Amino acid sequence: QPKPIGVGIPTINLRKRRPNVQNPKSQEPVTLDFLDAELENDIKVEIR
């Protein structure tokens, strides 16, 4: 899908976020491995 790959659990701190300061959004690529887009056998590893 057209959405950034996630890492870990997100934890935001509301109490530290000024209302109008323009925090950056994202710059990472969408690098989704093959063995993480399907169910992973022992045969699909050898095909990969």
Added chain:
Amino acid sequence: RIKPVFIDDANFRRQVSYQHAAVHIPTDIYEGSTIVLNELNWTSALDDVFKKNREEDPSLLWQVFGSATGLARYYPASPWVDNSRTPNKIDLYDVR
């Protein structure tokens, strides 16, 4: 400056102008240095190649020259998503 015509297009879900190339300069880089005004002077020769590339294959998406001084000259011309200060969302995009 240039005041572009900006037809609305598909293959780009926005309004583009096939007449000239647009230029992006990082927010904290003065456009008016001698270095910047010398890149805008010799990169102007790219627009004929931009147009000829696009006329040989009309299904072509962005073409960009990203320069080592921070500039990015892309074709076709299309307004940047963020004006730095006209809305309250400032942009940090460096081609480098």
Added chain:
Amino acid sequence: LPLFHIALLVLFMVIIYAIIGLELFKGKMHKTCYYIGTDIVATVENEK
């Protein structure tokens, strides 16, 4: 040796004014203008 009585008169004026201010302004400077729902104290460019 002569500056004794003057110092003994200053030590009691400081002690009297400490107690007066302790009576009047004790525990009054403890609220301030935070941003709403946040722990970032709100000020302007040169305002302490």
Added chain:
Amino acid sequence: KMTEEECRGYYYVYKDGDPTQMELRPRQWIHNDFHFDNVLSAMMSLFT
């Protein structure tokens, strides 16, 4: 920026010293208020 030809354009300032909370400010070549250019200004500065 160290000369007047460089001190043009905009720049980012970071509130609270936080690299994710910034603001655009036009940068300007500012002269001090008590400077030493002529002897009248130097005399004012030395007075203060």
